[PDB]
Amino acid sequence: QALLRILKETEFKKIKVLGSGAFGTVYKGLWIPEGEKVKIPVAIKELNKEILDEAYVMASVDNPGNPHVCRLLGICLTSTVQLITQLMPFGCLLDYVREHKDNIGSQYLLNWCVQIAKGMNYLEDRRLVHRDLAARNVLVKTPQHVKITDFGLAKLLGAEEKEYHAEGGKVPIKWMALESILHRIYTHQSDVWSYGVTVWELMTFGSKPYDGIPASEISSILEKGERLPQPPICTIDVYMIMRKCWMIDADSRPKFRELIIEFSKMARDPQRYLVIQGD
Amino acid sequence: QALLRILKETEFKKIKVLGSGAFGTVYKGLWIPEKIPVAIKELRKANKEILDEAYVMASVDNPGNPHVCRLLGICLTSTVQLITQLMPFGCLLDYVREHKDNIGSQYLLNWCVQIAKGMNYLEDRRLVHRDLAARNVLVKTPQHVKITDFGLAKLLGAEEKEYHAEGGKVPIKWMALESILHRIYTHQSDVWSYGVTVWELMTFGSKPYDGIPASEISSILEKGERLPQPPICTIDVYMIMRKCWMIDADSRPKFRELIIEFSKMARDPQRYLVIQGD
Numbered sequence: 113q114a115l116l117r118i119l120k121e122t123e124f125k126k127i128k129v130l131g132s133g134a135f136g137t138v139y140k141g142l143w144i145p146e147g148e149k150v151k152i153p154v155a156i157k158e159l160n161k162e163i164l165d166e167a168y169v170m171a172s173v174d175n176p177g178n179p180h181v182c183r184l185l186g187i188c189l190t191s192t193v194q195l196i197t198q199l200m201p202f203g204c205l206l207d208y209v210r211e212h213k214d215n216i217g218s219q220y221l222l223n224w225c226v227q228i229a230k231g232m233n234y235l236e237d238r239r240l241v242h243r244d245l246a247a248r249n250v251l252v253k254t255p256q257h258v259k260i261t262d263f264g265l266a267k268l269l270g271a272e273e274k275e276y277h278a279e280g281g282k283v284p285i286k287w288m289a290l291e292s293i294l295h296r297i298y299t300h301q302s303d304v305w306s307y308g309v310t311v312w313e314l315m316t317f318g319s320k321p322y323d324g325i326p327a328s329e330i331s332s333i334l335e336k337g338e339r340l341p342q343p344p345i346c347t348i349d350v351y352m353i354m355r356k357c358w359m360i361d362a363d364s365r366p367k368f369r370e371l372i373i374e375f376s377k378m379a380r381d382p383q384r385y386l387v388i389q390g391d
Numbered sequence: 392q393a394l395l396r397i398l399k400e401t402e403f404k405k406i407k408v409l410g411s412g413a414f415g416t417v418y419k420g421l422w423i424p425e426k427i428p429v430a431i432k433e434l435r436k437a438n439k440e441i442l443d444e445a446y447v448m449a450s451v452d453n454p455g456n457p458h459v460c461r462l463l464g465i466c467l468t469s470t471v472q473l474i475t476q477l478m479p480f481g482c483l484l485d486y487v488r489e490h491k492d493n494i495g496s497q498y499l500l501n502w503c504v505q506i507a508k509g510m511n512y513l514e515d516r517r518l519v520h521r522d523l524a525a526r527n528v529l530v531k532t533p534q535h536v537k538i539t540d541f542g543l544a545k546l547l548g549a550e551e552k553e554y555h556a557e558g559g560k561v562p563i564k565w566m567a568l569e570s571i572l573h574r575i576y577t578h579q580s581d582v583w584s585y586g587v588t589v590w591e592l593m594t595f596g597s598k599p600y601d602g603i604p605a606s607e608i609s610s611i612l613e614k615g616e617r618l619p620q621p622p623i624c625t626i627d628v629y630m631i632m633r634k635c636w637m638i639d640a641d642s643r644p645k646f647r648e649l650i651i652e653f654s655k656m657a658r659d660p661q662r663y664l665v666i667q668g669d
């Protein structure tokens with residue numbers, strides 16, 4: 113059962129903004145849980161029922177949870193409902209690879225790939241479809257430990273549902289499976305597609321997929337059989353997995369469970385699968 | 392609207408290097424169509440950026456403004472070269488260092504008017520410079536200065552109000568707080584930079600936050616510390632700069648207000664700037 117802890121607005125403080133958009137504002141804050149004497153660094157999101165949906169989804173997958181998925185800590189009931197979450201202090205992986213591009217060994221890159229798969233596999237075990245997997249939404253607790261984040265679009269599938277039919281826009285395209293782009297169908301297999309783009313982002317140390325290409329042409333370009341180029345550091349074995357994730361046939365794409373295994377093999381001998389200058 | 396002139400590379404030669412770095416190399420040059428002194432930028436991703444810089448310079452060329460360096464055209468060769476007008480006296484950052492002791496307040500405040508006039512034209516043209524600084528203001532005559540270096544400039548779409556960066560590299564000590572924290576950029580973020588630039592002119596070319604590393608500036612600013620009042624500045628002048636450095640972007644002066652204010656001060660230079668020898 114989904115069980116949301118309600119926090120009092122006197123329990124926690126916003127220290128500073130981390131990011132903002134029309135998705136709302138995310139602050140770093142500190143939280144003293146009532147009846148404890150310690151400060152907990154936390155992230156706080158505020159802007160309406162979308163936020164409650166988000167909270168519900170996060171709490172549905174809380175038990176028994178996974179170390180590679182961000183946990184909801186609770187919610188607060190002000191004018192606007194606020195999401196209180198764990199804080200990943202090193203920021204998103206997108207920005208981390210761009211900033212430390214020249215220090216990132218092959219061990220770390222394949223390690224992140226495994227964790228992301230581990231996290232998404234758990235989500236799938238819990239019948240959750242994320243719908244917004246990307247490197248911007250993989251956050252760094254420590255360089256050695258990353259976590260999937262941003263459940264704003266995430267959906268839970270019922271017992272006899274295999275897909276989710278979406279209604280409307282507000283979806284990032286260059287990360288979307290073709291059948292999501294054309295039919296607004298989303299499944300575990302569509303999240304696999306996104307996982308491919310994500311690994312791509314990591315392997316290019318944070319290049320913008322389909323750069324310069326307008327979003328209006330992507331379904332066209334993908335239908336014609338164009339995909340993201342092989343990253344320089346990637347042996348052909350690595351780039352093959354990515355390519356599998358972008359197959360037209362959803363069921364032909366790898367399953368997160370396989371991805372865990374495959375990347376675990378590679379991470380067990382990283383210099384054999386990625387060629388990075390300085391390893 | 393925007394037009395790009397392509398010029399015959401064989402019509403000119405690089406006479407000497409004016410300066411260079413990781414941004415590429417600028418030379419003095421001479422264009423002989425069929426003699427015009429010119430300045431020439433080339434480099435060693437980077438190739439796309441120099442075309443972006445050309446596009447942006449071309450996008451604001453008509454009608455242009457006297458206080459904005461115009462793109463004359465591009466040359467093709469192995470790599471794209473940007474041909475600009477040449478400012479024969481160099482950047483203002485240097486000029487106020489090398490003439491510390493012989494600058495009428497009339498000149499100093501005039502330059503602040505012209506800088507603002509150029510920035511306001513850019514703003515009308517929906518361009519955010521992103522790199523305003525004393526180094527990026529060049530002197531054509533003592534009476535004529537121009538904004539330069541569109542290496543980072545960005546245009547806004549008809550219903551965009553801000554530009555969101557990909558991080559990269561940026562001059563932190565000239566940047567608005569919302570640019571350091573959230574890497575947002577607006578005309579009002581340029582107003583911050585203008586503040587710092589005027590600061591550098593008033594201090595005859597001092598290094599802003601000289602000594603502090605760049606990693607610690609956003610803290611100083613968050614706390615509410617700013618650059619010190621310069622010796623030659625009355626309080627009216629310093630108040631102007633300080634308004635540029637306000638946390639609330641929409642509470643900074645607009646370039647149109649800076650033109651008005653500094654023109655007023657220019658009409659009576661000694662009242663606003665105390666300079667020994669005037």
Ligand SMILES: *CCC(=O)Nc1cc(Nc2ncc(C(=O)OC(C)C)c(-c3cn(C)c4ccccc34)n2)c(OC)cc1N(C)CCN(C)C
Pocket residue numbers: 130131132138140155156157182195196197198199200201202203204205206207208248251261262
């Ligand atoms: C890529 C930008 C980024 O993520 N930047 C960033 C992020 C964070 N930490 C953090 N920790 C948790 C959460 C989270 O799960 O928030 C829930 C929704 C309340 C977030 C976060 C989630 N979303 C959707 C965000 C959007 C924008 C910004 C953050 C989030 N973020 C920190 O913690 C210190 C810093 C940080 N930095 C410093 C900004 C850019 N650097 C990467 C350079």
Ligand SMILES: *CCC(=O)Nc1cc(Nc2ncc(C(=O)OC(C)C)c(-c3cn(C)c4ccccc34)n2)c(OC)cc1N(C)CCN(C)C
Pocket residue numbers: 409410411417419430431432460473474475476477478479480481482483484485486526529539540
């Ligand atoms: C402070 C450095 C400086 O600007 N020095 C300098 C500048 C110039 N003239 C000049 N004229 C035009 C341009 C220009 O618009 O170049 C475009 C991008 C092609 C430039 C110039 C532009 N950038 C970005 C530069 C970077 C470094 C150097 C110059 C530019 N510069 C001249 O022409 C006389 C001389 C000059 N001096 C010789 C260098 C130092 N003295 C001022 C002390």
